[PDB]
Amino acid sequence: AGECTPGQTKKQDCNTCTCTPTGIWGCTRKACRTT
């Protein structure tokens, strides 16, 4: 029904992202590296 399912997490770079219960696959930026 949509692009993604609100239950799948993806590993982009060093951070983690989760599918949203709307069809938009999103991620974060800050974390991992240095601190």
In a domain, 22, yes or no: yes
Domain interval for residue 16: 1-28
Question: Among residues 29, 28, 27, which one has the least CA distance to residue 8?
Answer: 27
Q: What's 1-35 look like in SS3? A: CCCCCCCCEEEECCEEEEECCCCCEECCCCCCCCC
- Number of domain units in the chain: 1
Question: Among residues 31, 1, 28, 34, which one has the least CA distance to residue 12?
Answer: 28
CA 9 to chain centre: 5
In a domain, 34, yes or no: no
CA 27 to chain centre: 4
In a domain, 2, yes or no: yes
In a domain, 1, yes or no: yes
